[PDB]
Symmetry: C4
Amino acid sequence: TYMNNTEAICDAKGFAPFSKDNGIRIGSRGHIFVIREPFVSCSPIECRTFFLTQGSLLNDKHSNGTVKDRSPFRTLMSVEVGQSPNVYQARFEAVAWSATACHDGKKWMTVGVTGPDSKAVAVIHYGGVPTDVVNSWAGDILRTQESSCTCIQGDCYWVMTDGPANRQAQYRIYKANQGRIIGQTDISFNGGHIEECSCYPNDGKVECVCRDGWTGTNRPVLVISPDLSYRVGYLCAGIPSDTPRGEDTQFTGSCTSPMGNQGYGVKGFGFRQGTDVWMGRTISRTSRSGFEILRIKNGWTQTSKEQIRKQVVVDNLNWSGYSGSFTLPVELSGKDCLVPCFWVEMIRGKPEEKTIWTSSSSIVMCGVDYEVADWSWHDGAILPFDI
Amino acid sequence: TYMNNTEAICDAKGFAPFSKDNGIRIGSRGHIFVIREPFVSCSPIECRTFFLTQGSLLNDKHSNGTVKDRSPFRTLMSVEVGQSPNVYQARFEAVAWSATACHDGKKWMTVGVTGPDSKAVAVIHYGGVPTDVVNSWAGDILRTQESSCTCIQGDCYWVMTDGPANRQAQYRIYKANQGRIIGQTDISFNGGHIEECSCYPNDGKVECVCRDGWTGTNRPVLVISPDLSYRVGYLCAGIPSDTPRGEDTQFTGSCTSPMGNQGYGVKGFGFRQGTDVWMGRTISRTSRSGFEILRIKNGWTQTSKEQIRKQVVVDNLNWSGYSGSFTLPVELSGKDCLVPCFWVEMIRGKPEEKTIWTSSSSIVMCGVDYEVADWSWHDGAILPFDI
Amino acid sequence: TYMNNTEAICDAKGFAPFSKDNGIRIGSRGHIFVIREPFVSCSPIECRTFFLTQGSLLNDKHSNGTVKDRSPFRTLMSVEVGQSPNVYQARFEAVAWSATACHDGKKWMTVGVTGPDSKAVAVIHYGGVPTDVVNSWAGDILRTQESSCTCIQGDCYWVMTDGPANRQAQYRIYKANQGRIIGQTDISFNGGHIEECSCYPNDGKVECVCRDGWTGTNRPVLVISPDLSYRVGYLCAGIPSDTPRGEDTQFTGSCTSPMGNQGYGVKGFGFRQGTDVWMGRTISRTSRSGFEILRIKNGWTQTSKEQIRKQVVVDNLNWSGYSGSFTLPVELSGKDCLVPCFWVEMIRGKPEEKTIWTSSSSIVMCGVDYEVADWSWHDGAILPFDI
Amino acid sequence: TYMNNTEAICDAKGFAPFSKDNGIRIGSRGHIFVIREPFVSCSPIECRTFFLTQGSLLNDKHSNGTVKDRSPFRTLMSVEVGQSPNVYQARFEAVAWSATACHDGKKWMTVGVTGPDSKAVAVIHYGGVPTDVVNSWAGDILRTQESSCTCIQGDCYWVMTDGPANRQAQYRIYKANQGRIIGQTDISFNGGHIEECSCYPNDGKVECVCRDGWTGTNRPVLVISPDLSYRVGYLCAGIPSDTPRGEDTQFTGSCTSPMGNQGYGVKGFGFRQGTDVWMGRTISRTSRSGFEILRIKNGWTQTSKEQIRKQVVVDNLNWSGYSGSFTLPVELSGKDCLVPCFWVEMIRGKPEEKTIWTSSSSIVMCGVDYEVADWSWHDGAILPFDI
Ligand SMILES: CCC(CC)O[C@@H]1C=C(C(=O)O)C[C@H](N)[C@H]1NC(C)=O
Ligand SMILES: CCC(CC)O[C@@H]1C=C(C(=O)O)C[C@H](N)[C@H]1NC(C)=O
Ligand SMILES: CCC(CC)O[C@@H]1C=C(C(=O)O)C[C@H](N)[C@H]1NC(C)=O
Ligand SMILES: CCC(CC)O[C@@H]1C=C(C(=O)O)C[C@H](N)[C@H]1NC(C)=O
């Protein structure tokens, strides 16, 4: 039966560790898929860690130039949380070099984009087989979330971007019901930019903290309603949460336009706490090192820079990376509110390291009503590997 | 309960990628079964990739002369689609150096042929254990489909060939109901030739595009009815779809007799689109390189050479191979028509390559109502291996 | 619900291959348990291959003196038929250097004997945990079947031997009902000898063809009734079916006493066909090479040497070994008679080979109403290994 | 439905082997998690072996200083009993360098402590996801049982220690009901010490034989009632069961205070047999070698030193280690009394051995009404490894 994800997100004063795969460390001797862009999405029975394999393993020659991003070998596969992305416990999702996934209370929906940049196709699967399709609509890398999509009473929604990664682009919202696409929307956001969004459900509306790859050091937000009516802009808070980013001191927040004179970024997330917001970010304002998450007061609605809580999960002496949001189905947590959880991708190898390869590890963190102590659950692998 | 595969095949304007195992690439460091003659068949809950192991793994000495075709070590085993043919996730089917499989809505039926060429036996299994048997009837390699067989309301049908691979032979159609053989038919087709057929269900009749290994560059077709009454000949279309094959320019199609002065071939498939036909074929008219699929107008009934669609899945600079047909049970796809899907075997190693071994990789492609862009999802392994 | 194994065995004119694991070949590169004394037993949903691990894998230093027979490392584990005895797909049964197993229509019963020779204990498990126990009763290696035990309407029976492997000994029959021992019997058979029996169900009575290790070249039989009343002696037939054995020419059969002047043997089996008997045996009368099975007319009741069928499964140029009997539950085969099946252990390494290790492979063969052609599905591994 | 663990423990005259994983031996060539602090806990369908991985495998460089105890890589994972702690059959529990687990008749509850010593957090999970949390309450290594916790009619209880491992500390009892903490207790035991308790259910009250790391050679006991009212002290018996420990001759038992002038220890267990007690202990009074278990008459209530039974499981020429208690749910054993079972950790490597690494193997032993013969089912690995 369908999963009602109508409830509001729970209010947490801190997050507790869910799991840690140790994929790379383990990957030093075991048969682990060299991957990247990992993420967690739960069904009403278990959570699984979805990844993107480079079509190869670690400590193997085929692990070589796996820094290339897109290729025909990458395929979306999944395993139960905590388990490393290994071959023998791996479940095949879809052929993809960019994917997204979500359960709805019955079957798993997956969407894997692959093919040429100028004509890539996004194949949606439902129950272990493709049901519908989307063709690149703007001939420039049809890419999607790299994060869990959202299902609310049988209808799962997600966001996609087609255009250049730098300047302006075209963003759309897709809505489905059993693998089948049932309507979509064009997002008007000129001057703005949306990439690899992180969503979660909160009151029958889908909230996403995306990635402005153009002119944004402050991340963009977008609330989606069940009838494609939407709302978009940037997370207000007078604090930037992208990387590379400028300092907090010299940064004025903006609920409306992008702020900062930086032009890149990394995938991140953020949760709406009433008006307050929990925002993840790399300790380093420049590199992809360390991961932290702060709660700015009234930061979801005001240019606030007033924090009441902070907590680190990866110190600045350890490689960080991507971050995503999802929720613990009420049918698992037992709460009467959607427990807010998130993950951190820990990339190892090129470019910041001397190795023929590039992969990443992850760790999962969930809500909690208590405040959880700063610490580091970093990758741990000793590079370089045997090669 | 039994699966009604009475519906007609759906009409597609193009195919979308289902999966890609990367068995060989992965096989460079992992424990993957050196195999060949792979194929996909679905049950009303999942699709599995059936293969033929050489009784050994990759990057191992026992991978040696695995180019030999038949031996006592080869056994039919299966894994969920997309997953590579690995040992730890492998399910044992039957002892075979030539097999076929199909689900019927309850249990899986498998038929594995093995033993000596002059007296090989085809052991049929049902539910994880052999139920009936067939003895070679013409003492010359009792071989079968290497493709998914067809079940329509409790009765699964398939085709077999006993005789020389070159000149004339003896073809038969077998019909069963729960592992148990319930009647059969002799196919009169003198001058004609049938090998490794590819079937699928379309309107309660079983359609197969087989392989003329004698004098056919154009492939043979055969519509089987539920009471063994059948119909046979070649796919009409003024275009040859076998390899080796002559050019299209100098080829007149023939709904009746084989055409072309070539005497070999490879396993292929084809779908009946109304009167139109989707036909797969290697880009190369000579070697086993590249894979493509065209839709010739009215090509199922007329000597047509009028195509309205084309699409590549493996460019001519990459190894191709076998191709097969199957369908997505309505109980998975949710359609009201049997979604047409197919796979491409990508052989690597001897003979076209310098390696002690020979194996292959596969990729799955399904129906779709939209037109899907040309591209290549080729093997990817870097040969030779460590040996 | 309980499985009625009251029916008679089906009458076969030949056997067809069920499976072949290729454990050793595969074991050359994969992680396979170095084992020995393998056997198959089925439940009403699947058959599994039970083995005895040496507590180590192949191509490893811990594979060393694994020719030793008994040790504290050996444990009974199982995997679905056909699958090799690998670690990652392995199910733990019991701690044993001698075991037996059987399902009853609900849960799996296993009995693993281990410990010191003068006080070994046989731990019986039911449903994945030990329920009852048996202590050595004659202080000289408490050993059992190494073959599937028999369950008939909730009560599973098996046989055990305590005494010297050479001269006289003490044999007993054990009967249980849900892991719990419910009565037993002492077998009076002075001058006779019983070891590693092979049983199967036939008309609510348990038939076993055991192994006379004392003075028997002709094997012993014993029909057990549901109330421990039994019947014992040797398989009549004027043909010996043990190894080492004397020729057939100079051998007079004996339904009563052991025959032949040989003092060793190997584990074998035999089926009661009306009055006729199917008897397995190594082609070689001296070494453990090749496996064959003949059907002597009226050989279950008369000193017959009149065969009507023969069939080889492993030619005399390939290593053979142990053989066992079991049946395909009616709830799998669908018959109205218990399909007779058997397996052949193919031992490789010491003593007949130059390797630090010793293990074995198996192959499964089942009933069938047709006659199946001679052939060889031998091990296949290339020794010696990397060591 | 909830599991009533109200019954009394069964009365055994000896224990029989349940399983043996051979993790290390196997770990010489296979992909086994280098671990430590293993333990068994059963649900009403199966028992699983829970462990603590060092976030790495064996025969790998990441196996290095795994003697360190606490780190961010260690995570609690589990596998079915007998199976080794391998990657491909491993189930992820929680992020922990100190854990405890128990089923309640529906879902599995796990509690993994991790993080910094001065602020570690104990994350409790229920059904495959964290439900509640506990923060270090005395800033000095928040650690727990390393043994199965106890559930009685929906409420699972366990014990934790926060303070120095040497002198005085703070002990607490936690009670939950579906991952959610429902009340707790402070244990007054000045001069006393409690660490890594071993509990089991006996008459609706939780009995634990813990570890006095301060001044105890005799172990402490504590009976917990369903309303947090408790009872504490040391196991009476005039025999010490800790290591290091003084001799039995010069040791007077004490139901009240710690006895002996030793200041360390190892994790152990003990069962209440009426008034009698089964107590496990290392043969060696000094090192962690050999494992034995005795039954002292009236030793649960009197300073007794009168034994009626003894039995060894690991001779003094083989490495021993940790020991724990649990029970076989009535829904598995079928008894009308909770069968008493236990396990022995067999540590190999540093410190007692010359290897870069440190791990351990285990073996499981259960109740039984018969007396079981002394023997040794020691590790078996040949060190040092390939490194
Ligand atoms: C093509 C632009 C896109 C969004 C900015 O780039 C991403 C950035 C990445 C990055 O910043 O590390 C890695 C992702 N693998 C990549 N996505 C694809 C499809 O290549
Ligand atoms: C024996 C003739 C048969 C059909 C033409 O050959 C096939 C052709 C093959 C090929 O053309 O590559 C490979 C198949 N493995 C082989 N089948 C068997 C049983 O050996
Ligand atoms: C101890 C005598 C017993 C029965 C004859 O020996 C068997 C013969 C064997 C053999 O002949 O190869 C191998 C078995 N592993 C062994 N059983 C045990 C427990 O060691
Ligand atoms: C910190 C004290 C604690 C209880 C005495 O130490 C244990 C003793 C151990 C030991 O004596 O071998 C190993 C355990 N891994 C360790 N627990 C932790 C959390 O490090």
